Amino acid sequence: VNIKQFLTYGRLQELYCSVSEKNLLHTLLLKKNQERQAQLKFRFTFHEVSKVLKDFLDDTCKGFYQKLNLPDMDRRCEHPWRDLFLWAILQNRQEMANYFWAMGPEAVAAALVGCKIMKEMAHLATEAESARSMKNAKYEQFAMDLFSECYSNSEDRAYSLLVRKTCCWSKATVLNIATLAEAKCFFAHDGVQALLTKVWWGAMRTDTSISRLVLTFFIPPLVWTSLIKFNPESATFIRVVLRRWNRFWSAPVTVFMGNVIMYFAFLILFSYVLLLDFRPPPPYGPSAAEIILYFWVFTLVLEEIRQSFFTDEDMSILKKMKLYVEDNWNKCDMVAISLFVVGLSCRMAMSTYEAGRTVLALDFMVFTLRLIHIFAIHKQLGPKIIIVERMIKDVFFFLFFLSVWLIAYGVTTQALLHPNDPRIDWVFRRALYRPYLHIFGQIPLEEIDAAKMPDDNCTTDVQEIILGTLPPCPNIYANWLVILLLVIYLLVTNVLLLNLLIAMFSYTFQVVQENADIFWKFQRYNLIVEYHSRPALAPPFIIISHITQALLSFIKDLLERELPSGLDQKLMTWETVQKENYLAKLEHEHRESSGERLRYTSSKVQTLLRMVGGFKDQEKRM
Amino acid sequence: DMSILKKMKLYVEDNWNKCDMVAISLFVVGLSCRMAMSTYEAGRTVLALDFMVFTLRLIHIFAIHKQLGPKIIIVERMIKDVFFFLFFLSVWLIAYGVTTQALLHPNDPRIDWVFRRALYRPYLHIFGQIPLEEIDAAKMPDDNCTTDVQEIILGTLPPCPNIYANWLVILLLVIYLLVTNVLLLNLLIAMFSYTFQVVQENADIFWKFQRYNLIVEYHSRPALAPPFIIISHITQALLSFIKDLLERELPSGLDQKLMTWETVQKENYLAKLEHEHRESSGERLRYTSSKVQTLLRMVGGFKDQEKRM
Ligand SMILES: C[C@@H]1CC[C@@]2(OC1)O[C@H]1C[C@H]3[C@@H]4CC=C5C[C@@H](OCC[C@H](CO)CO[C@@H]6O[C@H](CO)[C@@H](O[C@H]7O[C@H](CO)[C@@H](O)[C@H](O)[C@H]7O)[C@H](O)[C@H]6O)CC[C@]5(C)[C@H]4CC[C@]3(C)[C@H]1[C@@H]2C
Ligand SMILES: C[C@@H]1CC[C@@]2(OC1)O[C@H]1C[C@H]3[C@@H]4CC=C5C[C@@H](OCC[C@H](CO)CO[C@@H]6O[C@H](CO)[C@@H](O[C@H]7O[C@H](CO)[C@@H](O)[C@H](O)[C@H]7O)[C@H](O)[C@H]6O)CC[C@]5(C)[C@H]4CC[C@]3(C)[C@H]1[C@@H]2C
Ligand SMILES: C[C@@H]1CC[C@@]2(OC1)O[C@H]1C[C@H]3[C@@H]4CC=C5C[C@@H](O)CC[C@]5(C)[C@H]4CC[C@]3(C)[C@H]1[C@@H]2C
Ligand SMILES: C[C@@H]1CC[C@@]2(OC1)O[C@H]1C[C@H]3[C@@H]4CC=C5C[C@@H](O)CC[C@]5(C)[C@H]4CC[C@]3(C)[C@H]1[C@@H]2C
Ligand SMILES: COc1ccc(/C=N/NC(=O)Cc2cccc3ccccc23)cc1OC
Ligand SMILES: COc1ccc(/C=N/NC(=O)Cc2cccc3ccccc23)cc1OC
Ligand SMILES: *[C@@H]1O[C@H](CO)[C@@H](O)[C@H](O)[C@H]1NC(C)=O
Ligand SMILES: *[C@@H]1O[C@H](CO)[C@@H](O)[C@H](O)[C@H]1NC(C)=O
Ligand SMILES: [Ca+2]
Ligand SMILES: [Ca+2]
């Protein structure tokens, strides 16, 4: 059977029509067909499967069958193995999907597509067994192992494979398909991380020392010295020096260093303005440093807006805003800009001047917190941030138990100790603020224990208590109960709950570290990709880059590259050969496994015993 | 036979040697300053720091102990978790301290007190030092204090802490205490636990390697401790000017006997390896499968002959 000649578009349509009506694909096609019929031979046509693929693969499958609107039923499928793989994946037929993947031209991208579709269908599966099978699809493992073979073979053709635009998946890069598939473990592979490191260091050698890089950054003339080694590949001299300067100063690592230094400068300036150079309203006027700070924040907002909305040519504005608000650090950034605007507005007025100062102090807090996210690309700091995010839940469990016990103890002690105090603020003080401070070793026995209570003259009159002329007299009717309750509450909270929280953090760290590291590698991919369109000038100098780009656009990458036809064919042939080697090695290591040897020995011993018994019968006859 | 520059590089490659150089530099500077009236107090200060450094060297003196050395290596390995905790704590501490300084003393111009209230107090919050008497208005003592900038600078009266929005100050203190004293501290405890469990063995191997060098160092070390070691130094210098258990050269016969014994032991080792490989389960299965296949083919030939006969 010749699948290229066997599989036409008609047979593919017939295969899509002959769904067993008991799995997910039939229900999805039913919904799509009902929608198509309402909006108005074969039970389903290629438009329904195109819509299903769109739901799973937003634009990876664009033009697979819409382009010709359905194609000719009599024509051979251009990518028959791709179509069969998609058809088998869409209905959880993993054995045929494995076969069609092993028989396909572009297997890493196909495996990533299968991973994406399987994890998309795992949410839609009604039965638990099918959902479990989809959740154990192990197609990302196939992609990882095939790329391991490819990276071991060449390690240079592997990067080209990672960055080349695939023919069978609508010019989608393998890294693009991995990002869409959200393949954490594929991005954690050593080859992908090495390519990311090569991109990160730019034109410089990846073994460049950090100290020499910092010394070259602080002292620009050292760029032209041989202190920093670079990766190979009057007017001539000017061109050479300009090329060296632009090669050093446009690498992602130097851009990151400049951004970090300028953010430290921004925090220093913000704190100087807030603490030492904050002036009365415009009647007297904001200081010059405050105006520079306003301009600085304006440049920061421009960089954020550009990076978030002015980087993708084809992408929905509403979808871009949803992507922006989906990130919690972006929520922090919006909180920071809102606080800055509100504080500036209030500061411009005399009646709201102090409120403006307060809001600007909160804004400094928020920006200094953003400083944590700035260092998310560090090799050792990012996974720790992810680990903290994972331990927030143990923090919340401790907080639930502590809150219950704290409310009980605080309200009971308030009732037992100051029954006659009507002030709501002091009720809440003694009921929540004091027991909370008991956790941090702040135990003020001077107002809990009668023997320790100072004998300053104090009133029992309600009006005098409300007016604040004298403190209220703490009731000491049954103080043994107050002391006993304090003892029990201290025991519970400061021993059991605190050390239980310590134990929970220990266990969570030990069980989370590895997944946190894989997540960090996936996040590091996106962080490094963000520097491709990021200008080399840090704020506030980034205004120059913004103006230059805007003017160039109005007047007039290492990743995701398109190769010539010959090289692209050579690379796909090399990928197929590597896949054949991988499959042969798998079948070999299976064939000389202990279990297969035992099976072979048992079967052959049984057959040999039967044949020798026949021979013995013949000998007895003879 | 060893290069002077290479010897100096080897010396400065050791961090304990860096500590020793710091100690001797501090001693010399302190003595020099102490010899002068105008620098006497500075000399006393530097000599106190020098005592600190020497007492720290006392840790390295006990590096050859069976149980103490690996613990020193383990501490060296946990310094990195200390640094992670310090990064997170530094970020949160700077944020909280500067925000509280802005909210609470907006009119204080003294740089030293700005840095005090911005870093020294939040840092002490980690060790249970929470002075609510200057953070909470209801607890602030009513000693008479000035709002005049000149009087604040002169130090005649303490500045008046602003209590405009004190609920925010208390809430920020609550949140900062929660974060730093619970999450960061217990996370650091968890990180030390994991690091200890995953480091102890390699730390012990490193200690054994270091113990080799420490024991070798005693071959040329004189038996007299300081200050009596001056006698040994003078004696050796005079003997050199006027005129080991390890690394020994053997006679030819014994050396040949030892190399022959080594070769015989290596042959025994290789034979035992090949033997324990030959009677392994996998090799037995491979042998059985191959011989069963060959036997089946031969018995099939015999059965064909019997059918013919
Ligand atoms: C192993 C485990 C550890 C935990 C625990 O279980 C075991 O320990 C138990 C020990 C127990 C405690 C043992 C003992 C007591 C004492 C008892 O008093 C009863 C009241 C007595 C008897 O009528 C009278 O009171 C008087 O009040 C007056 C104030 O009104 C004071 O006047 C003051 O006036 C002014 C105040 O400024 C100043 O001039 C002076 O300061 C002073 O002149 C008197 O001086 C004082 O005499 C109350 C209970 C208490 C604290 C126990 C509580 C529970 C424990 C901690 C157990 C744990 C589970
Ligand atoms: C389970 C979890 C634990 C943590 C937490 O969440 C829950 O608990 C919450 C509880 C909450 C707190 C609840 C209540 C409050 C009170 C509130 O007051 C608002 C201001 C009021 C109302 O206009 C007025 O103030 C007045 O100021 C004056 C000073 O200017 C004082 O005069 C003093 O003058 C002199 C000072 O030396 C001396 O003569 C005396 O000392 C005294 O005469 C008055 O006495 C006092 O009345 C501020 C906020 C605070 C502290 C909450 C903070 C947040 C919590 C801890 C929550 C946690 C997240
Ligand atoms: C963690 C929660 C947050 C929400 C809350 O409980 C803890 O906070 C508490 C702080 C309380 C304030 C504290 C001080 C005053 C001043 C007083 O003159 C009038 C009452 C009022 C406004 C109180 C109203 C009730 C409030 C919001 C409580 C509220 C349930
Ligand atoms: C851990 C870092 C070390 C470096 C540093 O920040 C923490 O130390 C801080 C101590 C500060 C000192 C403290 C006291 C005074 C006295 C005052 O009359 C003039 C200003 C001056 C010298 C301050 C200048 C800025 C200094 C060095 C800060 C500096 C960023
Ligand atoms: C020890 O401090 C931290 C450790 C880890 C994170 C992770 N943020 N992970 C995020 O997604 C952002 C975020 C999350 C939650 C609360 C935040 C508050 C302020 C600022 C950012 C927040 C943040 C931390 O401080 C702010
Ligand atoms: C609990 O204290 C210690 C535990 C382990 C070491 C290891 N030093 N390991 C070294 O290589 C020397 C060194 C290293 C780093 C800082 C030092 C400061 C003072 C003195 C020596 C330093 C040191 C300690 O105190 C000084
Ligand atoms: C005790 O009460 C008197 C009023 O009679 C008052 O003058 C004094 O301030 C109170 N307490 C003290 C000793 O300060
Ligand atoms: C209160 O101010 C006065 C000046 O009028 C001063 O004498 C006194 O020392 C200040 N505080 C107190 C009560 O010590
Ligand atoms: Ca952002
Ligand atoms: Ca030494």
UniProtKB/Swiss-Prot annotation, chain B:
Localization annotation: Cell membrane
Range of residues in the leader sequence: none
Residue intervals passing through the bilayer: 16-34, 42-64, 74-103, 166-200
Intramembrane spans: 113-153
Chain ranges on the Extracellular side, renumbered to this chain: 35-41, 104-112, 154-165
Coiled-coil ranges from the UniProt annotation: none
Binding-site list for Ca(2+) 2: N17, D20, E217
Motif, Selectivity filter: chain positions: 127-129
Resulting phenotype, E76A: The antagonist NDNA fails to suppress channel activity
Residue ranges that the UniProt entry lists as topological domain Cytoplasmic: 1-15, 65-73
Domain of life where this protein originates: Eukaryota
Function: Monovalent cation-selective ion channel activated by intracellular Ca(2+) in a voltage- and temperature-dependent manner. Mediates the transport of Na(+), K(+) and Cs(+) ions equally well. Activated directly by increase in intracellular Ca(2+), but is impermeable to it. The activation mechanism of TRPM5 involves a multistep process.
Similarity-based family: Belongs to the transient receptor (TC 1.A.4) family. LTrpC subfamily. TRPM5 sub-subfamily.
Entry text on domains: Contains two Ca(2+)-binding sites that are allosterically coupled. The binding site in the intracellular domain modulates the voltage dependence and the accessibility of Ca(2+) in the transmembrane domain.
Assembly, per entry: Homotetramer.
Protein name (record): Transient receptor potential cation channel subfamily M member 5
Organism: Danio rerio
Section of the entire sequence shown: 778 to 1092 of 1165
